[PDB]
Structure formats: structure tokens, C-alpha cells
PDB file of C-alpha atoms in Angstrom:
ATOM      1  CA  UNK J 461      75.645 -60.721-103.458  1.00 51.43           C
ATOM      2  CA  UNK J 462      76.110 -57.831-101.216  1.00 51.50           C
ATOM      3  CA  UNK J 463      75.244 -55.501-103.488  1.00 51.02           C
ATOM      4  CA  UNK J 464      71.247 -56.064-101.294  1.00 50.40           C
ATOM      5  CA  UNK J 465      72.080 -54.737 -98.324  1.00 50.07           C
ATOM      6  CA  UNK J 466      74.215 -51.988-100.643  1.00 46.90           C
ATOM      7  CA  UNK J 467      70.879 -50.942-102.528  1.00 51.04           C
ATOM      8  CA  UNK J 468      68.644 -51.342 -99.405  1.00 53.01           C
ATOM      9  CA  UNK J 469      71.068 -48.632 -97.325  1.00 52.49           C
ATOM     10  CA  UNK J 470      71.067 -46.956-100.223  1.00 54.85           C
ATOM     11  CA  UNK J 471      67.346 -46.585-101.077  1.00 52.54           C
ATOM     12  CA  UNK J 472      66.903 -45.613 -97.383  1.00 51.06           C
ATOM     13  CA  UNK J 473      69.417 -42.865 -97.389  1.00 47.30           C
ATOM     14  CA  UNK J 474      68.387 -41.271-100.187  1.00 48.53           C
ATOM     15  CA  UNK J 475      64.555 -40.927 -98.591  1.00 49.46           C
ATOM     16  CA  UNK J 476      66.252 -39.387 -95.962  1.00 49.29           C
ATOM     17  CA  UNK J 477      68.450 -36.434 -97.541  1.00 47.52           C
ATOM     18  CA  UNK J 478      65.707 -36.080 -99.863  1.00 48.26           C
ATOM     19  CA  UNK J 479      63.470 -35.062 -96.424  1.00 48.27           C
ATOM     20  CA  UNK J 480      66.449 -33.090 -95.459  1.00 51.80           C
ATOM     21  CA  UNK J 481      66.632 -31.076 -98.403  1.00 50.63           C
ATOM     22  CA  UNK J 482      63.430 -30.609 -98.931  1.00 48.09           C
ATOM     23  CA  UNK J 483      63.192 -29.057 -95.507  1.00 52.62           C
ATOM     24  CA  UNK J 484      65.888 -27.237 -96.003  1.00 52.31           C
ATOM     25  CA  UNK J 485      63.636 -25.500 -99.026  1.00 50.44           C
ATOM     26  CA  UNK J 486      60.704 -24.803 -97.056  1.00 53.84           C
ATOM     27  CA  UNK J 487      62.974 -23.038 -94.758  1.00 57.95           C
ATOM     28  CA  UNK J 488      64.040 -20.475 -97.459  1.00 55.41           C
ATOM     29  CA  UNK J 489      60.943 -20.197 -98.795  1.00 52.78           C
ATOM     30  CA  UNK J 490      59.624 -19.563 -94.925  1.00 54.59           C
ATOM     31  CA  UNK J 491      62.018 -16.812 -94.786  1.00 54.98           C
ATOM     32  CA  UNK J 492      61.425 -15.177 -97.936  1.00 53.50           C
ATOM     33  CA  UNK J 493      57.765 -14.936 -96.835  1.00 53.99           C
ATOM     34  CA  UNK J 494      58.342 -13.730 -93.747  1.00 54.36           C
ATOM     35  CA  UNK J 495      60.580 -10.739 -95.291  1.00 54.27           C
ATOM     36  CA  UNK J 496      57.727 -10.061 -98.185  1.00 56.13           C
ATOM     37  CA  UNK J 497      54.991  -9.697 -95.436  1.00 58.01           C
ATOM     38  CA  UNK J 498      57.565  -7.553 -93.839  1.00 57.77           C
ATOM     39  CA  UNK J 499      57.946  -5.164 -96.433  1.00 59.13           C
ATOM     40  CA  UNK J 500      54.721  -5.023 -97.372  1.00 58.64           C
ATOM     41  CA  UNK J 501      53.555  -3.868 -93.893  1.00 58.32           C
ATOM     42  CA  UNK J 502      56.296  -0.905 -93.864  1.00 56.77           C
ATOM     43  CA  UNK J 503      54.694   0.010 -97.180  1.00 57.32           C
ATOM     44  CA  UNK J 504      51.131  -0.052 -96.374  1.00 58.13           C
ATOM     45  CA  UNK J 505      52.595   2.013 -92.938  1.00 61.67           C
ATOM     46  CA  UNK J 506      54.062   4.332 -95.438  1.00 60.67           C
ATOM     47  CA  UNK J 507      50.543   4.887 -97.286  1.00 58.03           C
ATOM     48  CA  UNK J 508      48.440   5.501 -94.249  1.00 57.18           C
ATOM     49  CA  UNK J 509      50.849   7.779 -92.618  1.00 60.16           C
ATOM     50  CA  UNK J 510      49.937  10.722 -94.821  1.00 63.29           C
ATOM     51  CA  UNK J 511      45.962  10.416 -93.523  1.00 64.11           C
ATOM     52  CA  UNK J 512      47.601  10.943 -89.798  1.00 61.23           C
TER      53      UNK J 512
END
């Protein structure tokens, strides 16, 4: 009979580290843009500095 309150805690918890996780992802992928955009300024730098 207490396998309710088992499921409900359960059901709950797993929303949870799901919403963790998740932002946990869009972290990384936050950080992998930010280093992209990074590297693509130095590189579009690069190009222009020959017209200087």
C-alpha cells in the first residue's frame, strides 16, 4: 500500500533532476557558443588586419 506515496516521491523527483540536467545541458551548450563566437571574432580580426 505504500508503494503511493513511493511512486508519487518518485514521479516528483524525477521532474526535478530531469530540470536539473537539462540545465545542466544548456549550460554546455551556452559555453560552447560563447567560445565559437569567440573564435570567430579573432578570425574575422585576423582578416581585416591586413586592410590596416
Amino acid at each position: 500500500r505504500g508503494r503511493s506515496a513511493s511512486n508519487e516521491f518518485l514521479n516528483i523527483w524525477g521532474g526535478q533532476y530531469n530540470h536539473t540536467v537539462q540545465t545542466l545541458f544548456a549550460l554546455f551548450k551556452k559555453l560552447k557558443l560563447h567560445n565559437a563566437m569567440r573564435l570567430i571574432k579573432d578570425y574575422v580580426s585576423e582578416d581585416l588586419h591586413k586592410y590596416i
